[PDB]
């Protein structure tokens, strides 16, 4: 066909060297990152559990044996122990990044090696918003926010030392103690302006990000609102990783998820392109639905 | 800066990710960068002197005038990049940025408003680094008291507000009622030609 | 699309770890054979030619 | 001969949406086996059959 | 050629000169330049072969081709 104008794609997810206006992108300056790359707050707070299938079983003692006061020559009576079972499964995260091979030679040679950190960050954020907030199409049935909803373990009201202490007290009502807080950085404003009216000490350590002596963890998510704060015994949140982040770079596949201007699927061998596929298998368990509580604006 | 212009490339969008069922199609995504650019403009002044003046009135006039010209340049630059004043040549300034994003508090100087002003940057995960103030603000800043602890947020001894440096502007264009907060590492400046 | 149920296929010859009811086939026991599998009767009866 | 492949399309299998199966997008593997085999009947009179009425 | 485009800059118009009377005003002129560019394009072909052909007819086909 001898058509030499560059290919338009739909969606425009393909990195290209030549722009449709004819601009040809030589002497490219490598973009620089205005931020530190994020990490999974679930993997920071929760307990790791080694997992080898896609599924894991847990079994715990429940009932325990009794005892009796027995007179001399009186018959000693009997007792029993019990256990209970729980289980968690994994799900898969993945993405593909397509590149034209002119781009990977004449614009950005190292593109995939510089994308790898950003793909890992995207997976970690996608996991955190699922397991903490019940957001981003949570595949599990299990999350902190949905545990709080079933137990209704919520305080309604403004940030005060009264409410923040009554929140942490809401766990020991069930014989658990808080290990950390989860909050939104937009609200350390509110933590900074509350003080003990009697000892005249401030509950939030602005210098070290501890609230009431416990560490605060900041979510970058937009789904956790200004007025909302979460507390929990995070040893009761368990995570596992059957497959680490694995990358395959492929020079020959077809991508039916992307189309050419004529409506045809993208074929990487025939159109002279490359793609990176990343996948990960990740599993979440909430070991005790009573272990988490939430403070919410009225 | 080696000429009248500088250019910057930053990552704008990171790639997405998908939950993928077994045997389901993994979908695509893209990274994306953005371009920004910075250019110089010229400050200048001429000082005319008669030869009688320079001979018989004031011999060292230019040598002692040089400092006052440098101050006039610094004041013109500050009054253009902070305030949108002095007939500013650049496209944008701090006052233009505030006016476009509308990050402004209507209110008196109180510890509540000073904390809400600093919080108005945390809305965007930016942490304030300093204040820009009018020295005739001190008669307001020093009468702020924390009603529980009765601590005062403005430190006489180090011209520091809520622990952050306060920097004072000598102009008539920053009024008596007004205070400015920023992450000032987001001011970038360059000087292709010293005076 | 963030769809996590397993793909249905036609004619459905794909071997899959997850069943559509959500059963995960871990702890799987390798199938054993109820027979001895057949040789070719052509190759048993006929003559081979290089 | 057995060839194992991780990136082909299979047109003879279709997704629930009707699309051909792509092994790279869908994170799959396929085994292809092939064999060449030949037959000759050297004398067609050499065979006979008994059949029910 | 590094990358797939190259640029060339050439002198174009050249300054004038004037005949100047004694105490007459000398006039002005300017130099000028122009740009040219050369760009690469891609040649390609695919040669498809059945593996019957590659086994039984012509093993060295993609070497001789």
Curated annotation (Swiss-Prot), chain B:
The UniProt keyword set, sorted, is: Capsid protein, Late protein, Virion
The cellular location(s) given in this protein's UniProt record come to: Virion
Its chief place of residence is: virion
GO CC terms: viral capsid
Q: What does the entry report about post-translational modification of this chain?
A: The N-terminus is cleaved by ribosomal processing protease Prp.
What quaternary arrangement does the UniProt entry report?
Forms homopentamers and homohexamers in the mature capsid forming a 63 nm icosahedral head with T=7 architecture. The procapsid is made up of hexamers and pentamers of this subunit. There are seven subunits in the asymmetric unit in the T=7 procapsid. Found in the procapsid with the scaffold protein in a 2:1 capsid protein:scaffold protein molecular ratio.
Q: What does this protein do?
A: Assembles to form an icosahedral capsid, as well as procapsid, with T=7 icosahedral symmetry.
Family per UniProt? Belongs to the HK97 phage major capsid protein family.
What this protein is called in its record is Major capsid protein
Q: Which organism is it from?
A: Staphylococcus phage 80alpha
């Amino acid at each position: 066909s001898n058509n030499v104008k560059p290919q338009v794609f739909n969606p425009d997810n393909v990195m290209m060297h030549e722009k449709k206006d004819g601009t040809l992108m030589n002497e490219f300056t490598t973009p620089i990152l205005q931020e530190v790359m994020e990490n999974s707050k679930i993997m920071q707070l929760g307990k790791y559990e080694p997992m080898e299938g896609t599924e894991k079983k847990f079994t715990f003692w429940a009932d325990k044996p009794g005892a009796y006061w027995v007179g001399e020559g009186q018959k000693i009576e009997t007792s029993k122990a019990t256990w209970v079972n729980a289980t968690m499964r994994a799900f898969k995260l993945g993405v593909i990044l397509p590149v034209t091979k002119e781009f990977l030679n004449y614009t950005y040679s190292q593109f995939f090696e510089e994308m790898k950190p950003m793909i890992a960050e995207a997976f970690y954020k996608k996991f955190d918003e699922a397991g903490i907030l019940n957001q981003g199409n949570n595949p599990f049935g299990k999350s902190i926010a949905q545990s709080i909803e079933k137990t209704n373990k919520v305080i309604k009201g403004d940030f005060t030392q009264d409410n923040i202490i009554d929140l942490e007290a809401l766990l020991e009502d069930d014989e658990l103690e808080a290990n950390a807080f989860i909050s939104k950085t937009q609200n350390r404003s509110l933590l900074r302006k509350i003080v003990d009216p009697e000892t005249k000490e401030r509950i939030y350590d602005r210098n070290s990000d501890s609230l009431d002596g416990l560490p605060v963890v900041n979510l970058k998510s937009s789904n956790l609102k200004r007025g909302e704060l979460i507390t929990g015994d995070f040893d009761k949140l368990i995570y596992g990783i059957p497959q680490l982040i694995e990358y395959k770079i492929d020079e020959t596949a077809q991508l039916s998820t992307v189309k050419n201007e004529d409506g045809t699927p993208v074929n990487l061998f025939e159109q002279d392109m490359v793609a990176l596929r990343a996948t990960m298998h990740v599993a979440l368990h909430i070991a005790d639905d009573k272990a988490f509580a939430k403070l919410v604006p009225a």
